[PDB]
């Protein structure tokens, strides 16, 4: 599998497209892997892995993405390619390192997800919540990571000098970590005080880390940046794992909260519009001022809520 992978050329009528913020891979599921080997020579270079090692690792990243109908694959991807885009965009901000950790971070911020929250796994004593009891599947997420770079031909970072390979590897850990939304919350506004007070300082390494958890969190939902097309197909996949862990709930007879009550569907469109104001917008809002050159996500962000709008007002 791996052996046609270092094969690939991605295709030259791709190469101006892959580097806009709204650019969908959906159509193009076969070049997946080799899509993610091209953004990481593009960015960190075609010297920063030793290509064979590159190419176990993301097709063993691809066999432990689970067939859930969100939280998969095509979402690892998604992801990592809106990193793509920033870093790109913002090429004198970060080390090469940050570049290289936060990419990897990326593909791998949801490995072996089940389809289920935190809230979820913790309600029912699940053997992760008994083991994370907070970020629960976040904490999952890095440790499956960990677990592939220690299989053999696997350790992409095996030339990294002892000491940069354990920078690497808490870089990796604290933008997964900040993927759980429970974090962002919290995040986003300590950043936006800091903001505010001109207290912000990149040379900080704990400003440095607020800054990457946004960066994150902006990524991973970055579903809501689409065109319209595609973000309302996504929507549905999103509900479509939300509505099956409220089938779980309701197989105890329990009855779940509306957003994961597939008969509360009618509410779907005033629950996105919601989620935008509540969330996304101050997220991409929040990440623009940080980083300018990332405006045309909150642009894109501004679009679709607008359409979810028409959508409640019948138009
Ligand atoms: C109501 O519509 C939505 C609600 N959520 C949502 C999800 C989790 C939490 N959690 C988990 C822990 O703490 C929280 O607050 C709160 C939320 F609002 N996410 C999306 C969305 C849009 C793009 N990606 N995702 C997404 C993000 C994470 C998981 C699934 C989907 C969405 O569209
Ligand atoms: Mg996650
Ligand atoms: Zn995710």
Redesign the pocket.
């Known amino acids: 599998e791996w052996q046609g992978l270092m094969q690939f050329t991605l295709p030259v009528r791709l190469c101006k497209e892959i580097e806009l913020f709204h650019f969908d891979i959906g159509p193009f599921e076969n070049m997946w892997p080799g899509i993610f080997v091209y953004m990481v020579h593009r960015s960190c270079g075609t010297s920063c892995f030793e290509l064979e090692k590159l190419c176990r690792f993301i097709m063993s990243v691809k066999k432990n993405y689970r067939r859930v109908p ?2 998969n694959w095509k979402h690892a991807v998604t992801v990592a390619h809106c990193m793509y885009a920033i870093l790109q965009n913002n090429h004198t901000l970060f080390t090469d390192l940050e570049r290289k950790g936060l990419l990897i971070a990326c593909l791998c911020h949801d490995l072996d997800h089940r389809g289920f ?3 979820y796994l913790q309600k029912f004593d699940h053997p992760l919540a008994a083991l994370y009891s907070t970020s629960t599947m976040e904490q999952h997420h890095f440790s499956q990571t960990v677990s592939i770079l220690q299989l053999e031909g696997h350790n992409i970072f095996s030339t990294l000098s002892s000491s940069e390979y354990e920078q690497v590897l808490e870089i990796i850990r604290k933008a997964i970590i900040a993927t ?3 974090l ?2 919290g995040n986003r506004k300590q950043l936006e005080e800091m903001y505010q007070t001109g207290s912000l300082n990149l040379n900080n390494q704990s400003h440095r880390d607020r800054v990457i958890g946004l960066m994150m969190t902006a990524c ?5 940046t689409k065109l319209w097309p595609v973000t309302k197909l ?2 549905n996949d ?2 479509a ?2 509505w099956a862990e409220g089938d779980e709930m309701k197989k105890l007879g329990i009855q779940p909260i509306p ?1 994961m009550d597939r008969d509360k569907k009618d509410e779907v469109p005033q ?2 519009l ?2 935008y104001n ?3 917008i101050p997220c991409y809002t929040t990440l623009t001022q940080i980083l300018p050159p990332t405006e045309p996500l909150l642009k894109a962000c501004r679009d679709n809520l607008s359409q979810w709008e028409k959508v409640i007002r019948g138009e």
């Open positions: 969100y939280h929250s935190n809230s759980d939304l429970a962002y919350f991973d939902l970055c579903s809501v996504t929507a999103i509900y794992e939300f957003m629950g996105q919601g989620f509540a969330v996304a």
